[PDB]
Each structure stands twice: as C-alpha cells, then as structure tokens.
Amino acid sequence: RGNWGNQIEFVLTSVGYAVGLGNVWRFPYLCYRNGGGAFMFPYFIMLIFCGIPLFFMELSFGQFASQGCLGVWRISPMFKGVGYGMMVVSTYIGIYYNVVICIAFYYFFSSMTHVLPWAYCNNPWNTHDCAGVLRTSPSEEYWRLYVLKLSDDIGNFGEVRLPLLGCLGVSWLVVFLCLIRGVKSSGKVVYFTATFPYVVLTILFVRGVTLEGAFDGIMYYLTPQWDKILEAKVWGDAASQIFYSLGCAWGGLITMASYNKFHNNCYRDSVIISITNCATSVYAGFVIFSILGFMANHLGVDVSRVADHGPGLAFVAYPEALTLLPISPLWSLLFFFMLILLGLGTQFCLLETLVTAIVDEVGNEWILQKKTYVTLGVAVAGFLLGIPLTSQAGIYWLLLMDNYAASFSLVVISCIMCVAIMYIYGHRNYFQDIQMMLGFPPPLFFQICWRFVSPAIIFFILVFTVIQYQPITYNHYQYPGWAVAIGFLMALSSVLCIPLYAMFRLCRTDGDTLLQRLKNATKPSRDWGPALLEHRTGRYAP
Numbered sequence: 001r002g003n004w005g006n007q008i009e010f011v012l013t014s015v016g017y018a019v020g021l022g023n024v025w026r027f028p029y030l031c032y033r034n035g036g037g038a039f040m041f042p043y044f045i046m047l048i049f050c051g052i053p054l055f056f057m058e059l060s061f062g063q064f065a066s067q068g069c070l071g072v073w074r075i076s077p078m079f080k081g082v083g084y085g086m087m088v089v090s091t092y093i094g095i096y097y098n099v100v101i102c103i104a105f106y107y108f109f110s111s112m113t114h115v116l117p118w119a120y121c122n123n124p125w126n127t128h129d130c131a132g133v134l135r136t137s138p139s140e141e142y143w144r145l146y147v148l149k150l151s152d153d154i155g156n157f158g159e160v161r162l163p164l165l166g167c168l169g170v171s172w173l174v175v176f177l178c179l180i181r182g183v184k185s186s187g188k189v190v191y192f193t194a195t196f197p198y199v200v201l202t203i204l205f206v207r208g209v210t211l212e213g214a215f216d217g218i219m220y221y222l223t224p225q226w227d228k229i230l231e232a233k234v235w236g237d238a239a240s241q242i243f244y245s246l247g248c249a250w251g252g253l254i255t256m257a258s259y260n261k262f263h264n265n266c267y268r269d270s271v272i273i274s275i276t277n278c279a280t281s282v283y284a285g286f287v288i289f290s291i292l293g294f295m296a297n298h299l300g301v302d303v304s305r306v307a308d309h310g311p312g313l314a315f316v317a318y319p320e321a322l323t324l325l326p327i328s329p330l331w332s333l334l335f336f337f338m339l340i341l342l343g344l345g346t347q348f349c350l351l352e353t354l355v356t357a358i359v360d361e362v363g364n365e366w367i368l369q370k371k372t373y374v375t376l377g378v379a380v381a382g383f384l385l386g387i388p389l390t391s392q393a394g395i396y397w398l399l400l401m402d403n404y405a406a407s408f409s410l411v412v413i414s415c416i417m418c419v420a421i422m423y424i425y426g427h428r429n430y431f432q433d434i435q436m437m438l439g440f441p442p443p444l445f446f447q448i449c450w451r452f453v454s455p456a457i458i459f460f461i462l463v464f465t466v467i468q469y470q471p472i473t474y475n476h477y478q479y480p481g482w483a484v485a486i487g488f489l490m491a492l493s494s495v496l497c498i499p500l501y502a503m504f505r506l507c508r509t510d511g512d513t514l515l516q517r518l519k520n521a522t523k524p525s526r527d528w529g530p531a532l533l534e535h536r537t538g539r540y541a542p
C-alpha cells in the first residue's frame with residue numbers, strides 16, 4: 001500500500017485537513033443564529049460523547065485493514081452503501097467549498113490597494129443609511145450591493161458575476177495543478193501552513209479585546225440560556241457542526257489511516273487531533289463576538305440583532321476589524337491568504353480521496369495509468385457544477401446546499417456504521433482486533449460510548465427532530481416549497497445508498513430462505529483482517 005513514513009508527518013497532515021473553513025467561517029454564523037451561549041453546552045456535550053469515540057473508531061477501522069473508505073467493508077459486504085454515501089456527501093461538500101474559496105480569493109484580490117474599498121461610506125454603491133466609524137455598516141453594504149448584487153428570491157437567477165467565475169476558475173486550476181504535481185504528498189511547509197493561522201488569529205485577538213463594547217459580546221458568547229436547551233433543532237445543529245468540523249463521514253479519515261503502520265498508536269492521535277481542531281473554533285468565536293459587540297455598541301442595537309443569520313457573517317465582521325489596524329491592506333492580505341491556505345489544504349485531500357476511491361474501485365491497470373485524466377475530469381465536472389452558484393441568486397443555493405445536503409446525513413451514516421460494527425460483527429471481536437495493534441484493550445469509556453451512549457443519543461435527537469417539526473420553524477428563510485423539496489431530496493440521496501445496495505446485494509446471494517440469505521451477506525469475506533502475513537495470527541491464521 002505504502003506507509004506514511006514518519007508519524008509526525010501523519011499528525012501534521014491530519015491537522016491540516018481537519019482545520020479549514022468549517023472552523024473560521026461555518027462555526028461563528030451557526031453559533032450566532034443559535035443564540036450564542038445557548039449553543040455552547042450542546043456543542044461540548046456532543047464533542048465529549050459522540051465526536052471523539054467515532055473519530056477513534058474510524059481511525060482504528062482504517063488502520064486495521066489497510067483499506068480505504070470502500071475497501072474496509074470486507075467486514076460486512078452488505079454495508080458498502082455506507083462508503084457510497086460517504087462519497088456522495090464528499091462530492092456535495094466539494095462542489096461549494098471551492099465557491100467559498102473563490103469568494104475568499106475575490107476578497108484577497110481587492111486588498112491590493114492603498115485604501116480598502118469597504119472602509120468608507122461615499123462609494124457609488126452606498127446609500128443614505130450608510131454609517132461608518134472611519135443604520136447600516138459599510139462592510140455589509142459592500143458585501144451585499146457590490147460583491148454579490150443579491151437578488152430578492154431564490155428563483156430569480158439574474159446574471160452571472162464574471163469576477164466570481166474568474167476566481168472560481170483560478171481556484172480550480174490551482175487545485176488541479178497542485179494535485180497533479182504533488183505539492184502536499186511529497187512536499188513541505190505544512191509546518192508553516194499549520195503555524196500561520198494561529199499567529200494571524202492572535203494578532204486579530206489583541207485588538208478586539210481592547211475595543212469598546214467587546215465585553216458585552218463576550219458575555220453574550222459565554223452566558224448559557226437554559227430555555228432553548230429543550231429543543232431538537234439546536235442539538236441537531238451542534239451535532240452537524242461537530243461531525244462536519246472533524247470530517248467524520250467524509251471518507252478521508254479511513255483513506256488517510258490506511259497508510260499507517262499496524263502498531264501505530266491511533267488513540268493518542270485521535271485525542272490530540274480532536275482537541276486541537278475543537279480548540280481553534282473557540283478562539284475564532286472569541287474574536288468574532290468581540291467584533292460583534294463593538295459593532296453593536298456604536299450602531300445603537302443589541303448584540304442579537306446587529307447582523308442577520310446568513311452565511312456571510314465572517315465576510316462582514318472580519319473586514320471591520322481589519323479596518324481598525326494600522327496599515328490595513330497588509331493585514332487584510334495576510335488574513336485572506338491564510339483563509340485561502342486553510343481552504344486549499346482541505347480541498348486537496350477531498351479531491352484526492354475521491355480520485356483514489358475511483359481508481360481502486362475500477363481495479364484494472366489501464367485506469368491506474370490514466371489517473372491524471374480522471375483527476376482532470378473530476379475537476380472539470382466540479383467547475384461546471386459550480387457555475388450556477390456565482391449568479392445573483394447563488395448565496396441562496398449555497399445556503400441550501402450547506403444546511404440541507406451536508407448537515408445530518410453525516411451523523412446518520414456514522415451511527416449506522418457504528419451499529420453495524422458493534423452489533424452485526426460483534427464488539428468482542430473488534431476489541432480483540434484493537435488489542436492486536438495497540439497492545440492494550442480500549443478504555444471502558446470508549447466501549448460504553450460505542451455500545452450504548454452515542455447510538456442512543458443520535459436516536460433520541462433524530463426522533464425528537466421529526467416530532468417537533470414545524471414548517472414555519474424549520475424553514476427560517478421563507479424558501480418556497482420546491483426549494484425545500486429539492487433540499488430534502490439532496491439530504492436523502494446520500495442516506496438512501498445503504499438500503500438500496502442492501503437489496504442489490506441480497507438479490508445475488510445464494511440461499512433458499514430470506515433469513516439464510518441475510519446471514520451469508522453479513523458474514524465477513526475471506527480476505528478480512530491484517531494485510532501483512534506476520535500479523536495474521538490467532539483467529540486469522542491460514
């Protein structure tokens with residue numbers, strides 16, 4: 001297969017893939033729309049009781065068999081729909097991740113001047129409601145009336161924004177060239193691309209605290225509200241954010257772990273990566289809410305009403321902070337360069353996983369010698385599918401894709417995989433498999449979370465989400481009926497991959513009765529187990 005080589009290389013490559021735009025762009029606006037401090041307690045509970053155990057499960061699953069997201073299912077051939085749904089979710093995410101990266105590119109290209117274009121209120125696109133520190137904010141007017149030229153409805157396509165299309169093309173070309181010339185795999189300066197963001201965030205942090213009114217923003221960020229805790233909407237949002245930030249059902253974790261050595265310690269790696277990834281979102285939230293408190297202090301409004309609940313909270317808040325620093329364009333350039341690097345690090349692995357999965361699935365040697373053409377085709381398809389998101393109605397489609405297609409399918413897929421491993425294969429067998437590599441049995445906390453706690457929590461969240469479903473409540477953006485139907489279809493497309501592949505496999509399995517056919521399709525194959533011959537001892541002996 002090809003081992004990773006050095007262990008520190010794996011730890012640094014996993015941190016660079018886990019930390020991305022979901023830490024600095026997605027977390028703050030979800031936290032703001034979920035009433036700030038009322039979102040933190042479910043978030044921490046979810047992280048402690050569902051995220052880390054499933055992260056460890058995925059890493060161990062990848063390491064033990066030395067297979068990717070589709071080859072690990074020799075343990076139960078009837079559950080390949082899990083990997084197929086993982087691939088579907090990865091495609092959905094990667095379609096619009098590059099659109100966000102291209103918006104970041106556009107903001108980076110506009111910082112190469114002497115005076116920032118979002119710093120004053122006298123521009124041709126400004127109105128009489130403009131109000132600036134040297135009502136409405138100049139940054140939000142720049143975001144709405146100039147960068148996007150937003151429409152009034154999701155069904156009003158309007159025209160295509162040419163600069164955004166150019167930025168998208170540049171981003172896709174950069175990704176393709178870096179992938180086919182091997183920038184990260186056989187490359188360095190992953191240390192710098194892991195150290196730079198914290199320096200930038202620390203620089204932005206000191207200025208925010210000094211501001212007037214930031215204390216109220218911080219208090220709103222930290223103070224918990226106990227009234228909104230009895231609602232299934234906030235818990236589902238917290239679970240979605242936790243599973244999205246760690247990449248649980250993306251399929252890249254298994255592929256990355258497939259190159260690890262047998263006796264590598266995946267428990268320590270999982271703990272370290274989870275803590276590092278989740279400690280980065282809190283810093284960005286601190287900075288963002290300090291900026292929000294300062295902004296609400298001088299606009300004569302409350303912290304909960306200063307901004308709207310759209311996805312463009314970062315592109316309105318961060319430029320306002322960047323304005324107040326001495327020599328603003330340099331800091332803006334550095335900040336947006338850091339954002340671009342954070343996005344590209346995740347996009348590289350996202351596309352590499354799909355290409356590797358396709359190449360391994362096809363299986364011949366002719367598809368192995370034409371990997372560059374496969375990568376080119378995938379890149380061209382992604383670029384073509386991302387074009388309708390650069391119109392005047394693109395942010396509506398992006399929001400629909402974000403909070404319908406890649407929110408709660410990850411949790412369902414992860415729970416199904418955990419249940420299949422624990423109750424169809426047997427928990428004792430998996431515990432012995434883990435002890436084979438680590439040398440000690442998994443701690444009791446992970447065992448109890450794998451057998452009882454996490455599946456029950458996910459079941460309760462899913463059950464109470466449906467019962468408490470209100471059309472007025474679960475819309476939040478006044479979308480029409482057909483848009484909601486499209487979002488539901490996108491949500492169901494990845495989940496329905498499991499039951500349909502189950503029937504497909506059952507239609508080709510020998511056995512008189514259906515019960516007999518259900519036992520042959522769930523039995524492990526003949527090649528399940530350790531890859532190397534020296535580790536095939538005990539219950540795997542020939």
Ligand SMILES: CC(C)CCC[C@@H](C)[C@H]1CC[C@H]2[C@@H]3CC=C4C[C@@H](O)CC[C@]4(C)[C@H]3CC[C@]12C
Nearest residue numbers: 162163165166167169170172173176379380383
């Ligand atoms: C092959 C895949 C991976 C990348 C796609 C390459 C092509 C289609 C891309 C790369 C650079 C892009 C161009 C960059 C700049 C501009 C200027 C803008 O005013 C019109 C669009 C235009 C002309 C873009 C159109 C599409 C473009 C030519």
Ligand SMILES: CC(C)CCC[C@@H](C)[C@H]1CC[C@H]2[C@@H]3CC=C4C[C@@H](O)CC[C@]4(C)[C@H]3CC[C@]12C
Nearest residue numbers: 403404407408409412465474488491492495499
């Ligand atoms: C049991 C398995 C086989 C099927 C489960 C499918 C159902 C129950 C699940 C899968 C994904 C879930 C959806 C994912 C995302 C959203 C967006 C949210 O804004 C409204 C709820 C909604 C729409 C969820 C409702 C329930 C849902 C549709």
Ligand SMILES: CC(C)CCC[C@@H](C)[C@H]1CC[C@H]2[C@@H]3CC=C4C[C@@H](O)CC[C@]4(C)[C@H]3CC[C@]12C
Nearest residue numbers: 411412413415416419451452455456458459462
């Ligand atoms: C993936 C989700 C959203 C779809 C529904 C599947 C889950 C929630 C269901 C299907 C099988 C169920 C599990 C089957 C067996 C047991 C053993 C029991 O001692 C504790 C509950 C537990 C663990 C059940 C809890 C809920 C469960 C995990």
Ligand SMILES: [Cl-]
Nearest residue numbers: 023027245281
């Ligand atoms: Cl996060």
Ligand code: NA
Nearest residue numbers: 020342345346
């Ligand atoms: Na990244």
Ligand code: NA
Nearest residue numbers: 018019245246
């Ligand atoms: Na993350």
